[PDB]
């Protein structure tokens with residue numbers, strides 16, 4: 001029926017590094033990217049730390065002139081996208097430009113730009129609003145600007161599914177390729193929600209960790225003293241490519257994208273069901289899509305946000321799907337180190353899943369000092385674990401009960 | 413080797429009515445839904461009119477308690493979705509709930525809520541932000557809340573592709589069904605961007621008509637005195653359903669969704685290429701997807717925003733795709749009456765395209781007093797035109813050069 005999809009390029013901005021290799025080095029070393037926020041005064045907020053991108057220079061990617069019209073989340077998405085395309089070695093021509101598209105998403109988009117324009121509006125009226133405000137702030141402009149810069153004329157769209165955005169973006173891009181609508185897609189997500197509205201909005205819901213005294217210990221998935229997620233910024237992008245297309249041009253293949261599953265909890269606007277039933281259906285859908293039995297899974301990059309309800313639901317879901325094999329696989333949350341990159345989480349975590357396959361190493365869950373009741377799987381506590389990994393699964397779950405799972409496999 | 417997709421239910425809020433029949437009556441009568449905006453003081457703005465939803469009562473759909481947590485764009489999306497599901501007659505059970513999903517999108521989402529929370533933040537600090545601000549404002553919560561209210565556990569996501577949102581949402585939902593990922597999808601879009609940031613943001617770009625003296629004459633697609641688009645609010649939703657599934661339960665079928673095409677211009681962040689080359693590729697992709705020749709198209713619901721560059725580009729694209737047949741088909745812009753519903757435009761216009769098939773009538777382009785250079789097609793100026801319509805095509809184009817086309821056909 002359908003064509004095979006491989007990963008030929010990757011790119012990233014994260015709290016651990018300004019590219020993929022630097023981020024991954026941090027991941028394998030168990031390094032935290034979390035620190036007190038420097039770019040605003042959070043004296044009035046109950047959370048004053050997060051995962052910032054440190055030392056980003058947009059002028060590596062864009063002229064200063066172009067960059068000034070774009071919200072940070074667009075700058076970040078473009079940086080990761082450009083990295084991924086260069087990493088792939090793909091040359092865009094008239095013969096293929098209609099076959100190359102883009103699906104880069106975001107959970108909340110240009111919140112910083114909105115906040116700044118809203119200050120001008122209230123203080124001075126609508127005349128001080130930027131002419132570039134709309135195109136420089138809306139979520140589909142990563143896809144838009146990337147297509148313009150690289151001459152990409154294929155399917156051009158953007159997902160916004162909260163914390164599931166990056167996973168859905170990659171999965172649906174893979175579908176485009178499998179079904180023949182494109183031969184190449186740049187896919188993933190980006191987020192920069194570290195502004196007053198973001199910190200204040202999540203804080204108002206009491207969803208964020210408030211461990212201001214020890215920011216690097218705040219994100220502690222499955223630990224009994226977890227107290228909410230850590231807000232982080234950045235971007236991940238992957239070049240997905242039809243297999244024969246990749247082979248014909250001698251592309252370096254990182255891994256194969258073999259499965260994509262989706263589900264809805266239909267339970268609650270922000271909380272998962274305690275048994276993770278929706279997450280279970282999603283993982284099973286992804287495995288069925290990949291033609292894999294649960295027992296063939298070696299590594300799970302969990303969603304693992306460090307929220308009370310979320311973390312335990314994901315354990316329940318994994319035990320339901322995997323049975324006894326739940327105790328043979330390794331499962332880790334790299335959010336322990338990166339925090340929660342929101343709409344970018346699924347994108348950077350897809351990249352980490354691919355690199356786990358490349359390097360045959362399960363990244364750690366740092367800060368897992370005291371696993372909570374029932375959190376008795378191999379959660380790769382504290383230190384990276386070299387091991388055999390043929391199949392890696394990556395989960396994302398989001399507000400609205402919206403679930404996504406990707407399955408990657410070593411490529412021969 | 414894929415399954416057929418039919419439309420079994422429709423729902424709508426528009427500037428012409430609080431449901432589909434009332435809106436369509438206005439469409440066929442050539443009525444304008446455009447008026448001076450009443451819900452805010454626009455004395456400081458250069459545009460003071462738009463297409464408002466008049467007399468909406470959210471309590472027809474939701475308790476007051478539930479509604480106070482939701483931005484207007486979510487309220488509108490849910491109203492259209494609930495209408496569409498009721499219209500379809502579908503009964504959700506344990507046997508089918510995993511096979512029913514939702515794809516309702518938005519271009520800018522909860523701008524009103526953001527603006528109000530930003531006022532509280534600046535005046536009083538972050539402690540005044542609502543706990544419901546994030547889940548009540550993010551774009552994927554139409555899909556989220558609908559799934560929760562109706563118990564829908566199938567694919568759950570949201571597109572955000574500017575003015576193309578509603579078209580992409582419907583097309584990609586159709587793909588889910590065709591490829592067996594779902595048997596039923598509720599799909600479309602909603603928008604409520606009529607706040608200071610919205611009017612101010614589009615005004616700053618000088619994109620809006622400023623014909624404040626005659627609001628009902630402002631939206632005039634292809635007319636030589638057009639001066640930008642008219643901002644409008646509302647929602648459209650369709651129940652898409654696999655054909656055998658519909659037949660088995662005795663569903664009333666409105667029409668068949670036979671084609672979906674996408675492209676990128678890769679040209680400019682807001683302006684289309686003068687020749688509409690991207691729009692041409694998109695329409696051809698949709699026709700190829702449907703297995704139709706251009707000569708089988710009888711009616712085009714144009715994007716037709718009443719912008720200088722946009723309107724003429726779409727004429728060029730139609731002449732390119734259809735050749736001599738461009739002069740045999742009928743093409744109209746219902747934005748002449750409704751204005752531009754942004755992320756909802758493609759959804760309400762898909763509904764209008766389906767009803768054109770049902771009623772064998774091409775809706776008018778009102779206000780087309782003096783067609784501009786080269787606008788010499790049958791643009792259904794002024795008055796509705798009864799005629800044979802077997803195939804109806806609906807276009808949406810958006811910021812970032814992102815294009816979508818849907819093709820519907822009469823169902824036997």
Ligand SMILES: Cc1c(NC(=O)CC(C)C)c(=O)n(-c2ccccc2)n1C
Pocket residue numbers: 107108161162163164202207229270271272303305307309310311342343397398399546550
């Ligand atoms: C905490 C959070 C989300 N939920 C999850 O991560 C799922 C888990 C805890 C069961 C989620 O979707 N968001 C979010 C991301 C982007 C925009 C809006 C909301 N957050 C913060």
Ligand SMILES: Cc1c(NC(=O)CC(C)C)c(=O)n(-c2ccccc2)n1C
Pocket residue numbers: 134138519520573574575576614619641682683684715717719722723754755809810811
């Ligand atoms: C005018 C406008 C857009 N562009 C078009 O309608 C296509 C153009 C060739 C006439 C568009 O995408 N938006 C928009 C919609 C939602 C959010 C952001 C932007 N507008 C206003």
